[PDB]
Amino acid sequence: GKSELYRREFYQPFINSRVLELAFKHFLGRAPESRAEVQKYFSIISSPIVRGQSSMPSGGLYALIDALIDSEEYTSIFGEDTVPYLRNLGVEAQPSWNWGAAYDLYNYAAPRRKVPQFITLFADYTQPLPNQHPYGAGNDPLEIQFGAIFKNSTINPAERAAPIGKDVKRILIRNGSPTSNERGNPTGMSEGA
Amino acid sequence: MKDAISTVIAKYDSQGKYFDNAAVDQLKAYFATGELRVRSAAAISANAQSIIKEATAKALLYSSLTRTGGNMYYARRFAACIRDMEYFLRYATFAMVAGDTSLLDEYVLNGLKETYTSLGVPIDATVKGINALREVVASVVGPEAAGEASKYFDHLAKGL
Amino acid sequence: SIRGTSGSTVARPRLFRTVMTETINGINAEDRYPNSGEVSQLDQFFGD
Amino acid sequence: GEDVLPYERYLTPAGLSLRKGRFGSSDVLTTPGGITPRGDAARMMDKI
Amino acid sequence: MQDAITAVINNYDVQGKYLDGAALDKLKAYFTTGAVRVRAAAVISSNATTIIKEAAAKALIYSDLTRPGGNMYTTRRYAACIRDMDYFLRYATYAMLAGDPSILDERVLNGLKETYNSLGVPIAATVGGIQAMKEVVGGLVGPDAAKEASIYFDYLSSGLS
Amino acid sequence: MQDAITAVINNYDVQGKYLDGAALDKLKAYFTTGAVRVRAAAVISSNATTIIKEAAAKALIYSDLTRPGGNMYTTRRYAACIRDMDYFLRYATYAMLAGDPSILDERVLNGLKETYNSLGVPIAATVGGIQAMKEVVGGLVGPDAAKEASIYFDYLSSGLS
Amino acid sequence: MQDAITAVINNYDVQGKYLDGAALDKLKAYFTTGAVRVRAAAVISSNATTIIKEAAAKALIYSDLTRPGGNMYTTRRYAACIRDMDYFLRYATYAMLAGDPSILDERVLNGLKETYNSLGVPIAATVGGIQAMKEVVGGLVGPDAAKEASIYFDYLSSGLS
Amino acid sequence: MQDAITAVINNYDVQGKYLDGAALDKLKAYFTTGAVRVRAAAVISSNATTIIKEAAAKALIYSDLTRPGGNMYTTRRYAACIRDMDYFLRYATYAMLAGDPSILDERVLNGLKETYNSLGVPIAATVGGIQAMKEVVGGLVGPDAAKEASIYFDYLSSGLS
Amino acid sequence: MQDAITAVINNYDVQGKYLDGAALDKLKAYFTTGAVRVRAAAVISSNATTIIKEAAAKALIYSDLTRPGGNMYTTRRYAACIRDMDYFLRYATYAMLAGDPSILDERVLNGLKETYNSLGVPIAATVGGIQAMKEVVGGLVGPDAAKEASIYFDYLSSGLS
Amino acid sequence: SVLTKAIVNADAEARYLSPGELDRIKSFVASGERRLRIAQTLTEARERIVKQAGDQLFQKRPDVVSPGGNAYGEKMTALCLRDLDYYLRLVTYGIVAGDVTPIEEIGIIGVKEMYNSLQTPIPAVAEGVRAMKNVATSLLSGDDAAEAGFYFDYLVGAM
Amino acid sequence: SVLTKAIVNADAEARYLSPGELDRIKSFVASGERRLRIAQTLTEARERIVKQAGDQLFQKRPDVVSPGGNAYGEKMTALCLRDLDYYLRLVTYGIVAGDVTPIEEIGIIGVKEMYNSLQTPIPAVAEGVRAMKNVATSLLSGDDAAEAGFYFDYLVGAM
Numbered sequence A: 001g002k003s004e005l006y007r008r009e010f011y012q013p014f015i016n017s018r019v020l021e022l023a024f025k026h027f028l029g030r031a032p033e034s035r036a037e038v039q040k041y042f043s044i045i046s047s048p049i050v051r052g053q054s055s056m057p058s059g060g061l062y063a064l065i066d067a068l069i070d071s072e073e074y075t076s077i078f079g080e081d082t083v084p085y086l087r088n089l090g091v092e093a094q095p096s097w098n099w100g101a102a103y104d105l106y107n108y109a110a111p112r113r114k115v116p117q118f119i120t121l122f123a124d125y126t127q128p129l130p131n132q133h134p135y136g137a138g139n140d141p142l143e144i145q146f147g148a149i150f151k152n153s154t155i156n157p158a159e160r161a162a163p164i165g166k167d168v169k170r171i172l173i174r175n176g177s178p179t180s181n182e183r184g185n186p187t188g189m190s191e192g193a
Numbered sequence B: 001m002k003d004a005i006s007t008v009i010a011k012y013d014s015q016g017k018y019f020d021n022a023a024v025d026q027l028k029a030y031f032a033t034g035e036l037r038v039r040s041a042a043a044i045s046a047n048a049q050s051i052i053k054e055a056t057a058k059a060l061l062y063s064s065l066t067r068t069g070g071n072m073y074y075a076r077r078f079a080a081c082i083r084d085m086e087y088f089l090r091y092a093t094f095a096m097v098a099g100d101t102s103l104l105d106e107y108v109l110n111g112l113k114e115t116y117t118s119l120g121v122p123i124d125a126t127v128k129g130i131n132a133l134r135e136v137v138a139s140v141v142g143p144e145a146a147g148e149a150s151k152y153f154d155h156l157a158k159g160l
Numbered sequence C: 001s002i003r004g005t006s007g008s009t010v011a012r013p014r015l016f017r018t019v020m021t022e023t024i025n026g027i028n029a030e031d032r033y034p035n036s037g038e039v040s041q042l043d044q045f046f047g048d
Numbered sequence D: 001g002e003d004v005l006p007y008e009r010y011l012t013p014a015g016l017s018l019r020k021g022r023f024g025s026s027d028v029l030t031t032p033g034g035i036t037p038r039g040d041a042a043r044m045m046d047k048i
Numbered sequence E, F, G, H, I: 001m002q003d004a005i006t007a008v009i010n011n012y013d014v015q016g017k018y019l020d021g022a023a024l025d026k027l028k029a030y031f032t033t034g035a036v037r038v039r040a041a042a043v044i045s046s047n048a049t050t051i052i053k054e055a056a057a058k059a060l061i062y063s064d065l066t067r068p069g070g071n072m073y074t075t076r077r078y079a080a081c082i083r084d085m086d087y088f089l090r091y092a093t094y095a096m097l098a099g100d101p102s103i104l105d106e107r108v109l110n111g112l113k114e115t116y117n118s119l120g121v122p123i124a125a126t127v128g129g130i131q132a133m134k135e136v137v138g139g140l141v142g143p144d145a146a147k148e149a150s151i152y153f154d155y156l157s158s159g160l161s
Numbered sequence J, K: 001s002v003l004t005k006a007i008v009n010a011d012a013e014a015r016y017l018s019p020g021e022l023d024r025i026k027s028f029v030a031s032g033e034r035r036l037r038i039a040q041t042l043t044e045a046r047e048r049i050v051k052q053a054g055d056q057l058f059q060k061r062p063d064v065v066s067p068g069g070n071a072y073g074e075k076m077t078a079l080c081l082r083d084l085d086y087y088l089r090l091v092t093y094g095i096v097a098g099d100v101t102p103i104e105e106i107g108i109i110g111v112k113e114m115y116n117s118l119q120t121p122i123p124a125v126a127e128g129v130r131a132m133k134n135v136a137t138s139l140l141s142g143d144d145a146a147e148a149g150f151y152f153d154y155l156v157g158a159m
Ligand SMILES: *[C@H](C)[C@H]1/C(=C/c2[nH]c(/C=C3N=C(/C=C4\NC(=O)C(CC)=C4C)C(C)=C\3CCC(=O)O)c(CCC(=O)O)c2C)NC(=O)[C@@H]1C
Pocket: B061, B062, B066, B074, B075, B076, B078
């Protein structure tokens, strides 16, 4: 983890929130399971190091890696002898609240997605539902003069799904005078430009 | 998590309000109920194993699921379903104490339909099993605390 | 319902171990081509 | 209505941020009834 | 959206169960509350303009917001803010009749934070306005109605914050 | 979309190379398969309604899905599911004629997973239905055609899962 | 993953049926092929490095890919491509022993398309390489083994394309 | 990440071209700017705490955000916001030394918008803070350095918005 | 969009200040420059086709881009690239008349980077083309006009990069 | 339900609920208790209603329960009766709601498409619903029957 | 709150709540009514507590309200008093909760960082809280004061 090889392969190409999620998967075999843990770890990697006498660079991302190996959950399950293994459907049960995300984290395509998946999911549960096409974030075209530019699922995975019923209505911003908007007044389009 | 005391607090801090009598009333209410909720929880813990078994019998058992080509079929599958019924009970009890529904959905409801659809588990059956747990629980609990205990069960049912 | 969905993943668990699978799964974890010994173990399994 | 040709009536929040957001928000997002020291020091120099 | 009557129906429909006495009792409970709710709604509709006026006077106006450089400065922005206030009031009234908070989630609450952030509208001030409306509404509706009315107003406030 | 013939052409065009014998051989291979494919397509079109019916019977109906609380419960949902099934069949037929999987990616496969996740439609069950359609189709088309037909069905299944 | 034997068993288990003789015959067929499969697997393992070398020579090298600005340009990329080739070979061998294509779907085929698209690896060239490996493998294994080996190679190719 | 020197090298490497005088001139240009950049970086590091303080005073503090129900309300959130500000400053300094915007894209910019939207952090306010930091930084660094510093700050702002 | 005159007005309006001499001076500065700008705009419009031709000749054509496998290979892509070039020229002319860069941000610059990345259009080459157009434009407009014209071209270039 | 319908119309108009609309809501809440009783009656008689209606339908349409016909065979006949039961449950839901909307979303949208895939004849299904109405009417008191009839008629109209 | 803490420990252990844990919950619910009164008292006296504490603090530390000092000026002095008010509100929340956790999340995490950016001296803030405690203690009865003191002490310890 501290090695030069481990960064640049991981860490250097990701944003810090994504690095802590991959570092979960490979060091502990689980996905990150809650909002409070992805916060504790985000503060470790974020925190400027206390100056360390050991030439081995102090904390930083190294702190992240320490905190994981030094964790009781780590040491207990793996022990000192075992190499970490991926816990999975067969072993250790596997929780429901992170299921979809975790199974994506376990696949080898995981390092291809660059947007953080765990922080978005946690706290998307606490928030009201987003401003997006019902059928998905990818279904909204980019808004530019000419051209239809969508995000493609394969070329870089960044899916955001949200459950939006038949009844839900999008909030749209009027291009024009705000009081023209037809939600608050039905006759607003038949008004002066 | 969030429980009835801390819920009232949390609504007040976002407004920046000190605690009002209106808030103090909601808090009093919890404290009145609380004493028997503690009693009802102990009843449910003791009889839990029995409660599950009765519930399974009423709905899950003697269903298509038990027959081969159903989820209940096999000892392995049967065991899993029981674990799930035990899950639903602990949480509902945890929810009964505290008195806030949210503990439920953070720990149970969030993601459940997605796992179940992935595993192939039938959602409707689980809902039936939960409703069964509710009736058994109510009898053990007794009538006054039953209204309380039924709420958390119903939340779980509509969540699924 | 929930505010957010992580999504659904088609996952299949293993009902019963089989000798066929058990040998393969060891090979994959090793990331090695079929070892000399197991090859002999497999064909007796095929004949028997 | 048979004589106007269609025009762009509405747009989504993300579309709106694309056009206007470069350079972000100018303003301090003032609130009612807030103690703020903003503008005080300038007013003192204008007086002097 | 959903209402109390439909909520009961939907729960039974997923079970596939015919309506039963226990279900009927829940429906009956709603029906008793209904008369009060209808009276409250009529009060709110008649006094809607005033409710908004009073609430704005309490929080929004005579403030930095209305002064130049404030979000509610300029006629266009002022008019928008009072339009938003009206929305909140109308939806809360709908919710109170329904007896369910779902409509608020489906129409008002969904994507509001994001919209406001792009617009640069201040959320905390808006929440303040909603709370002010609640207080005014509470008076007009009277105590029994006020409790029911308050929950929907609080729901909106919690969503936005 | 793209087909086999155009795929070869496009690969050569990016190279700027004139068509060569090796390229011609690939084209020739397609031409032999072509006649079989045309016959298969006509069979599928005529039996499309039945294919869907049989596949539903094999997997979707007489199941928890159709029972109350299941995804395909209610007429509206049932109708949606069979509409989706028809889509998959039509596109697979197109792909089989084309000899290329690309159309499936461009039309069906792109964004389907995300759509389904938002809807709460179960992917595994859908995959099951696709596999069922394949089996029914295999019978009607006959063995030579079946091999060709199967790959496109499998492609759809892999994409969804 | 799944194997041929287990696939038959599972189908029967859902029916609840004891194994039919016809089903037994299919299992019996597999058991005879298994001896030949084991011999083929040993051949492939011993000649794996050469198989990859020959296939690369046939398709990948002396090409734009290897030339600067090509996907397989630079030592790092070249090494990656041959590593991928080895994966395909190893998994196809596993599939041949198993008698089932499922392992390919579960490990190799799942997420490959997405990985490749992000990387900008060309799928058609990769498919070409797989086909080349198949041809080389066919020679070494001998005719009876070749037919069995070919189906898994073709399965990989169809998945990628 | 990439730097100006490496960017030139990489462009030549894809072409396969040996380094040429025109390329050398770009490298030479960077080398002259380098000394200024190093001085600017040292200034920023020493005054980092103050820069953040001043910028917060200009935009964030004394606002709805800090008031209850605002995003930066509560100590925990306040601390988070200033931590984010520090990140932006540190990365901009890195970019200025490098002479390339790429590091900002690779670490800061990628996925931040989505994260913020889920969190409900207001992007426009954050952008405002970045712009404020730029202004403060401009003063300290001095004019020659300021132009260089400004581009990276603007790059961050454009990415977020 | 916004123009220099309106920009001054807007800045004063948020302050609530009446127009003052310092503000007047900025307005006066614009008015003097105005006549030159109008002449420059007419020159550009008349020579637009040639400007694009010359710039393409300098950077785009006789290059790998135009050669097979290059982004601007095929008539369709070539036509698209020159259409984009025309857009940049027209918008820069608009900006020069306006005396404000805002229109570029609102129409051209927003989402362009993302669009280009999805398309696989090379940003650096595009930037090169813009710079080439600037040089050609500079000649035609003459020195006084050139300085004004250059800033908008540079603004576009910085946005893209 | 009535209330949902009223709210929806108001929201489209972007207005508060009209006094007239409010009055209708008031009337509905008063009617509800009576409606609950009507629904309860049908629920108790449900098993017999379905059975009687089924027999009538099969007499009216021999073809449906014939080797060619969809209904033919025990499995198929059970499914046909199950469908009749479903529609009755929907009708009860409608009576308590005071609107056809609950009925409509569960049963009447996509019904044509579903039955066409099944190959079940839609007119025969309609006859079955008509048959159920007649049985239900007999058990209900006259005024109660009229209320129930409206919902039954809607179903018949929809298919 | 006490209850949340107990539930969380149980969930970690994956067990139903222990009898001992249940007993502590029982004790807490009995204590709650007394706690509510203590909180109510402080809320009513809030305005005076803040005022008195402020004066004491400013006497103890002339410097903070001096041209060099952070607190100096009307605007700044108001903000300093607002901060004191915030901490008092947090203390009341704590008393009803029976735990410092509510206090801790809102006020004690990141407090150092926030004040360091502001440049406010942390020790002065602590003195203000101590001052508030003394005022609060006087109004409260002795036993009530002891309960309140614990929460006040925690705040002082945290800063
Ligand atoms: C009683 C002396 C005799 C008897 C009858 C019997 N069985 C059950 C219940 C179950 N039996 C099973 C069956 C199996 N599942 C497996 O995985 C295997 C191993 C291959 C078997 C045989 C199971 C799972 C149950 C429980 C639920 C179910 O009905 O499927 C009962 C009733 C108990 C109950 O309801 O839990 C009875 C009376 N079995 C014998 O062999 C005895 C001679």
